[PDB]
Every structure is written in C-alpha cells, then in structure tokens.
Design a protein around this ligand. Structure first.
Ligand code: UPC
Ligand code: CA
Ligand code: CA
Ligand code: CA
Ligand code: CA
Length: 903
DNA sequence: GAGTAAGCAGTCCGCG
DNA sequence: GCGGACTGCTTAC
C-alpha cells in the first residue's frame, strides 16, 4: 500500500514523524531535515524556481532548520524578502508525500478516554492535581476495546470491584444499563493503589500509543489532570512518557478573555471532541455538558444518580464506573452519527497538515496553496505584517415589515467561491485597476464598461482571463467535493420524505428493511416495495436515511465552510495571501450581483404579469432574493387550484421553467458587463412558501433585516410530507431564549402562518394560563459568562455590569463557603432567572452553570422567588409583540364595540 | 489567528 | 417611563 503520515513534529534540528509503512505497520523516525528557502535573484541567473509573480528565485539549501531560521532574521535585518515555506514540518510532509495521500483509517490509532477524580473540596483543578485519579476508561479504535482502570483503595474510600453482570442489567432492575453491544468489549482492570494504576496506565499507553486523542473536554480537563498528577507522584520526566517523543509544552492560549494552561503532547494529535463539535456541528447549544449533547444528538436520557458526584464513588461505586464507561461510549456514538473524526482526517491529509491544524482554515489553506504552487516549482511569498483594517461585506435590503402570503426564494450556489472563480481572483492574477463609478451605476448598467480585456469587480480590480490563479484552482477542487456530498445529503433527504409519506399507511406483515443506498434517489421499484413495508421496517429505513443525510451534511457543510473560509481569510492579516483588494473584490461584486438581479427580476415579473414598476422582490441578503408570488397566484386565480400541493407544483414549475432562465439571462449579461473569465452565477430556487390552501394562515412575515418566518412546502427540490417552518433570526432560533419559550413562540408562529389570528389567540391564552407550571430550567434564559472579574467589585455589581454577570455575582454570594457548590467558569454558559423584589439574595437576578440543576441549598429559594411576570414579559410577550405587530395581527382580542353584547 | 451586517437586551443618563 | 448612546451577545449570510 501507499505510505502515509500519522504525526509530525519539529524538535530542534530534528523532524519526528510517526507514519504507516508499505506493509501498513506503525513506525517512527528521527530525520535531520534539510530545509530550503528562496531569495530573488537577477534575471541573468538561470533557475527553475519562480515566485508567484514570475520573478526568478535562488534556492538556499540549509544544513539544518536553525540555519534557515537565522537566515530569515538576517534577511529581515537587511530588508529583503525570505521566500518559501517557513513552517518546516509542512515542507517535510510535502517533500515526503509528494502525491495525493491515500490513507487507511483502520491503521490509525484513535483513542477516546475520560477520567474520574473524587473531590471533597470542590472542582479538582488540573494544574494542582492534588486528588487521586480513581477511574480511567480508555477506548482504543484498533483493538475496539474499552480498557477500564478502576481504583479500589483511596483516601476517600475503599470499594469493592465493579460488576459487569450488574452493569449490564436494566436500571429498573438496579443495574446500570451499560449498552449490550459493548459489554463484550470491556477489559476491566482493578487496582488496590493509585501508583500501580497510573504506572500500568503509562505502560499500556506506550504499547497502544494514541495518534488521534479525543473525548469530552480532554484538552482542558482529562489530559492536563493526568499529566500533572503523574508529574506530582513520579516526576516530570515520567509524565513526559505521555509523549511518544518525550517532549511536552505547558502551553498558553492568547485571545480575548482569560489566561489558562493546557499541555501539548508532542507526537500526538489532540482533537478534543467538544472543539470538533463546536466547529463542525453548526449548532449553538445552551450547554456543552456531555449529558446535554448526548440527549440532543441521540435522544438518550441523562445519566441518573443520587447525591453529588463527590460522594458517588463511595455511595455507589458500581454506578460510578458504569457511568465512566458509558460517557466514553457516548462520544463514540455521537461521532458514529456526525463523523467529525472522519472529516478531520479527510481534510488533514488532503491539505498535508498536522491533523489538529484542521481547526485553522488559514493553516489549512496555506498548506493547500503551498503544495499546489510547489508542484509547478513556484515559490511562495513571505508572510508580512499588516495593520487590521475594517472593510465592507454584503448588502442587505431593508424589508417592509409585514405579512407576506406567498414567497419564492432564490440564492446563488456557493456565492463567494463562485465569485472567486468567475472573476479569477487570486494574488497572482491581478492585472491592474480601473476608475470606479458609484456602485448603483453598475447595478443600473449606466456605468462605462470597466474593461475590454480583463475580468473585473466593481471594486476597481482587474484580473487576467487567460490564466488560472492558484486560489480559483484549489477552491474549485474543494467546491467540487462539496457539490458531490450535498448531492448525497439531498437525495437522502428526499428519500426520507418518501418514507414519511409511506408511514401514513403502514402494512401489517413481518418483513425486513430494504438493502438500499440512501445517497441516491430511490428507484420506482424501490418506491413500490416501500409502499408494502411494515411500520417497523419503514422506521428503520427512515433512521438509516436520516443517518445518511446527517453524514452528507457533515461532509458538505464543512467543505463549504473551508472554501468560504478561503474568501474570509483574504481579509485576515495573518494569512500569507492577505489582500483587501481581493477580499473587497468578492464582497463588492456580491453587492452588485444581488442588487443587479433584483432589478432584473422585478423587470421580468412586471413584464410577464403585464404591469409596470410593481415591487416583486420584497427582501434580500448577501446572495439571496425573496419574491412575493401573490401576483403570480392572483394572475391565474386561487380558485383554479385543487389543493395546496397543486399551487406548490405551479410555482415550482414557474420558478424552474420561467424565472431561473430569466435569472440566468440576467447574470450572463452581468458577466459580459464585467468581462469575467467564466459565468458561474447560478441562482437556483430555494424555498416555496405559503399558507395551506383554504386556510386563514398568513404564509409568512418579516420584522426587519435577518428576521423572518416562512411556512415552507418545498426546499431545494425536497417536497415535504408536512410543511416545515423556516425561521431566521427570531427568538426561537437564539440559544439565549429559554427552551419552553422557543417551543411556545414557534407554536405561535406555526399558528400564525398556517391557521390564522383566532388560532394564535387561543394558544396565547393557554400558554399564559399554564406557564407558571413549567420546570424552572425550561424557562430560564441562557448567556455566555465573559469578563466576570471585570465587574466584580467586592462580590457586588460594578458599573455597566451586564444582567447575566450580576446573576453570577448573586450566585457567588449565595454559595460563599459552600464547599462543593459548582463554580461558574469564565467564558462558559449560564442559566439566568429574574428575582422578585425583597428576595434573600439581595438582587434582581440569579445565574448558575447551564446544563445543571441549581445546587439544592439555594434551589428552594430560587423556586420561591422566581419572577414569573418579568420572565414572561421579557422572553415571550415582547418578542411575540414584535412578530404580531409586524404581521398586522393581534395575539390578544382587542377591545371593540361588540364587547357590549353577550356571546 | 476565515470575513462583515445587523438585530435586541441591558445600563447609564437625561428629562421642570 | 422611554429615547439615545453605549456594550455585550447573538444570529444571518
Ligand atoms: O459562515 C458564513 C456563511 C456565509 N458566508 C458568505 C459566503 C457565502 O458564499 C455567502 C452566502 O451564504 P449562504 O447562502 O449560506 C451560502 P453558500 O452560497 O456558501 O452555499 P450554498 O451553495 O448557498 O449552500 O455568504 C460566509 O462568509 N460565512
Ligand atoms: Ca465524569
Ligand atoms: Ca448561497
Ligand atoms: Ca403501505
Ligand atoms: Ca442565502
């Protein structure tokens, strides 16, 4: 097989690489790597190395990596550019794997682990590690085994062995309900003292050395706790055995809020799953506890136990160990669904970076572009310092706040990357400039055509048509990968809907789910069988379909993120190819595009409807337009339609057969106008929205920019079995809005959009009537707790103190001297509740860590003093007021002359 | 060390 | 009691 790297590190003048050899065996090697860098030379000098602008360079081959670094300094002291890859492990990887990396995941050791630590004195800080590590579950992807390290004897209690028989029993049977599919995979190792447990853990670590190290919060908790604990017991160099190359760094992160210390284990690629989740999932959760995310991603119940975690090992060791094991499994289950480890690996090897560098689009693209240019013997520029400057982004049309009955939306395929490719925007494709007209002049086709010769953006930039830039070339490769996966996700999504329609009439027989590939639209024959299947079979199929759609989602959305990342990175000063002319070329072309096509669409629709100057485009943002289809519908008359699906079919056909061509024609003209390399402005229909036919539903509404609601029947070709709400920006979409209020507001919106004013009024009355009976957590607000110290004036609120911070300060005072009350962590999320005046907390609000029940010592008082009135007004009524007034609708029956009668 | 646009809640402060 | 300037947080794209 072809060889591929596992990890690479630079240590002095040495490259340390773990790799898989041709026999598929894991190896390590120290390499005295001899780097190269480049200096411009005169034209007189024969060379095969040119920089990106075509200037000749001379190769400087250094005897070691320090030599190359010193040379960079000397070049700075002279005032001349030092060209080439300055991150030597990237050059090494590039030189060592000069071919497309084909990797095999079954040879890559992936470790998932979680430790337990009993603490009678509050949170066990990793930097101190003054408490015994009393459990470790470590899952090894190559043995496919959960290795369990269990401390029986500890200063905090001596316990009996954990029972695999009891762990496997149902909870309702006194057992721990450890999932059956992993019972046979547990290897249990009890220990009578800490020292032998850790020694045995290290010895096992050397034998099964992680390549990818993951789990939940491993980077901030488990890894540094294990390191510092081993350090304190055995010494630093023993703790250093956690590194395959016996090198570590007690690191520091430089950002915006705080000052922490994590451990860099050299020769290991750490991907804390919480970080993967935050980057790749595109959710913002009110909490990031594993219980919460597990419930969210998998619909498994919260791991139940009695009393604090600081007493769990002693009161119920049986459950303590089982839960340690289950928590490890849960991350594996989330990854089986989301597939972020697979994605990370795909991207890492594609770019030829250290795998942990997937968190940095900038690093990722620097490597991709470097490897691309090197193939053509081109020499990359030296990174330069730049001052941070703001620059303009997208256009957003101010919408008229209102209800909007029928709406058809259209949006450009991969807009920013497509602009890059259309205009040929790259550092080396710059041809010059032209004198700009005001933007509106391009929008309205009155401005002098920018160029006969070059490809242009209305920002003033000109690019070569006759040659490809490394940016367009490489962004196109990743775009095409993205396209393929979106194709799979949408097919699976459509297949899902075929299955949901078939569940309306489930057959009564014993059958099996069909062996199909959900990535491709079901054949007619498959559709026929589906119509005969049992409910059991169908639901299993729906599950499989939905798991396929999730996988395509992960793979498509994050390749999209990567390419969109390339466009944004051009405006980041740390990017080697930083250039505000290129960044601005994209955004400004985007602004023109959106407003250009708004004009063309109003023109076209006025023409086909035989009217003039009517406004069909009601709203737009970045690359999207929203079209009022009321007149399209009135033109034919609502009477002519059989059911809802009939008119959805009409507008679908209208968009595809009439509008899109007119849109295409409009953009091809703009392409010619800007003399672009390639026409790539593809604006496909997104949503088809309206009320159910015959209903009092209002279809949709806008309250302002980025704030709207649509009852959608078809989305990018997916015809839903049931209408689905498309809500953007409104409180139901915000993680700060309480759970039960999101739910309540959404149901209000659903009623407005599908049923009408009377239905809405009915529901509102009920909610206000019953809401006081909701669980306090479900009605608590959520906020990130940033810069807490800044507003802490002797335990009390300082000036300009934010509401949620004041609650944190209220919490701190009420738990002062409470030994095991959970401390709020700076930068993390809290629940927040308003308090009635005269409460025994002495302030107007309280806040405690999200995802957790509030400590029982102050829960009582919180429940008693919660201010339901304020909580409803603030989170529910006031947003609902915004929705309804914009929609010209009432949530409560207004007073009227009819009040004089008895109905 | 991907980007900008833009909405809403809240504090401070003015207002016979 | 509510506006406007201000920060903080959060979303749409
Ligand atoms: O996180 C983001 C989101 C958007 N955009 C910019 C760049 C985006 O190109 C642009 C439009 O945003 P969408 O309509 O959501 C996306 P796109 O067109 O990428 O992908 P489709 O083919 O529609 O799934 O906004 C960003 O720069 N960053
Ligand atoms: Ca735990
Ligand atoms: Ca788009
Ligand atoms: Ca059937
Ligand atoms: Ca869009």
């Amino acid at each position: 097989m072809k060889e591929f790297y596992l990890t690479v590190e630079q240590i002095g003048d040495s490259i340390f690489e773990r790799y898989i050899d041709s026999n598929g065996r894991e190896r390590t090697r120290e390499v005295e790597y001899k780097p190269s860098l480049f200096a411009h030379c005169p034209e007189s000098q024969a060379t095969k190395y040119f920089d990106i602008y075509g200037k000749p360079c001379t190769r400087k081959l250094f005897a070691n990596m320090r030599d190359a670094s010193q040379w960079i300094k000397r070049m700075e002291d002279i005032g001349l550019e030092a060209l080439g890859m300055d991150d030597f492990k990237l050059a090494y990887l590039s030189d060592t794997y000069n071919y497309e990396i084909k990797y095999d995941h079954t040879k890559i050791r992936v470790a998932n682990f979680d430790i337990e630590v009993t603490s009678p004195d509050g949170f066990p800080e990793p930097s101190q590690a003054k408490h015994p590590i009393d459990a470790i579950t470590h899952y090894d992807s190559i043995d496919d085994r959960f290795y369990v390290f269990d401390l029986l004897n500890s200063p905090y209690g001596n316990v009996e062995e954990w029972s695999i028989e009891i762990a496997a029993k149902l909870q309702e049977q006194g057992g721990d309900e450890v999932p059956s599919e992993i019972i046979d995979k547990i290897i249990y190792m009890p220990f009578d003292n800490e020292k032998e447990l850790l020694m045995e853990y290290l010895n096992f670590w050397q034998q099964k050395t992680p390549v990818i190290l993951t789990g939940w919060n491993v980077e901030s908790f488990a890894i540094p706790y294990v390191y510092n604990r081993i350090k304190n017991i055995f010494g630093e160099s023993t703790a250093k055995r956690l590194s395959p190359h016996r090198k570590t760094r007690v690191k520091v992160i430089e950002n915006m809020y705080g000052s922490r210390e994590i451990i860099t284990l050299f020769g290991i690629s750490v991907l804390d799953y919480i970080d993967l989740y935050k980057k790749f999932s595109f959710t913002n959760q009110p909490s990031y506890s594993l219980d919460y995310i597990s419930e969210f991603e998998l619909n498994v119940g919260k791991l139940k136990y009695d009393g604090p975690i600081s007493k769990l090992r002693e009161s119920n060791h049986q459950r303590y160990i089982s839960y340690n094991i289950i928590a490890v499994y849960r991350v594996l289950q989330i990854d089986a669904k989301r597939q972020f480890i697979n994605l990370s690996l795909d991207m890492g090897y594609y770019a030829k970076i250290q795998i942990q560098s997937v968190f940095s689009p900038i690093k990722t693209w620097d490597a991709i572009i470097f490897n691309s240019l090197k193939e053509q013997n081109k020499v990359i520029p030296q990174g330069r310092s730049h001052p941070v400057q703001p620059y303009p982004g997208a256009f957003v049309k101010e919408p008229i706040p209102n209800r909007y009955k029928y709406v058809m939306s259209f949006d450009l395929t991969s807009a920013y990357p497509s602009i890059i490719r259309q205009v040929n925007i790259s550092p080396e494709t710059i041809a010059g400039t032209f004198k700009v007209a005001p933007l509106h002049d391009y929008i309205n086709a009155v401005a002098e055509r920018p160029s006969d010769v070059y490809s242009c953006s209305p920002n003033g930039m000109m690019y070569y048509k006759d040659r490809d830039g490394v940016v367009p070339t490489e962004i196109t490769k990743v775009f095409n990968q993205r396209k393929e996966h979106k194709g799979y996700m949408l097919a699976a999504q459509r297949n899902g809907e075929i299955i949901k329609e078939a569940l309306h009439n489930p057959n009564l027989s014993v059958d099996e789910p069909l062996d199909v590939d959900y990535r491709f639209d079901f054949s007619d024959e498959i559709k026929e069988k589906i119509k005969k299947l049992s409910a059991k079979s169908l639901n299993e199929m729906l599950f499989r379909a939905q798991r396929t759609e999730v996988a395509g989602m992960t793979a498509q959305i994050n390749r999209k993120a990567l390419i969109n990342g390339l466009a944004g990175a051009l405006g980041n000063v740390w990017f080697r190819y930083y250039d505000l002319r290129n960044a601005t070329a994209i955004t400004t072309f985007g602004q023109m595009a959106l407003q250009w096509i708004e004009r063309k669409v109003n023109e076209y629709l006025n023409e086909v409807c035989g009217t003039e100057g009517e406004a069909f485009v009601l709203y737009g943002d970045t690359d999207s337009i929203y079209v009022s289809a009321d007149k399209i519908i009135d033109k034919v008359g609502e009477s002519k339609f059989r059911d809802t699906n009939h008119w959805v079919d009409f507008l679908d056909k209208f968009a595809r057969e009439r509008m899109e061509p007119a849109i295409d024609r409009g953009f091809r003209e703009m392409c010619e106008y800007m003399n672009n390399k390639q026409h790539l402005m593809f604006m496909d229909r997104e949503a088809i929205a309206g009320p159910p036919l015959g209903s009092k539903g209002i279809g949709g509404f806008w309250t302002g920019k980025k704030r709207y609601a649509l009852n959608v029947w078809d989305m990018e070709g997916t015809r839903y079995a049931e209408p689905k709400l498309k809500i953007m920006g409104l409180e139901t979409q915000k993680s700060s809005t309480p759970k039960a209020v999101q739910k309540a507001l959404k149901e209000c919106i659903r009623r407005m959009l599908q049923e009408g004013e009377e239905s809405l009024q009915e529901y509102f009355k009920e909610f206000e009537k019953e809401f006081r009976q909701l669980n306090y957590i479900s009605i608590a607000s959520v906020s990130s707790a940033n810069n807490i110290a800044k507003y802490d004036v002797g335990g009390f609120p300082g000036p300009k103190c934010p509401f949620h911070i004041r609650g944190i300060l209220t919490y701190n005072r009420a738990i002062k001297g409470n030994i095991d009350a959970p401390q709020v962590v700076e930068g993390e999320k809290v629940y927040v509740l308003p308090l009635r005046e005269g409460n025994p907390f002495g302030d107007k609000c309280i806040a405690w860590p999200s995802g957790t029940e509030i400590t029982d010592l102050i829960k009582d008082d919180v429940l008693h003093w919660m201010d339901y009135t304020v909580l409803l007004e603030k989170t529910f009524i006031k947003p609902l007021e915004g929705f309804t007034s914009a929609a010209k609708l009432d949530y409560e029956k207004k007073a009227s002359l009819f009040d004089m009668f008895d109905f």
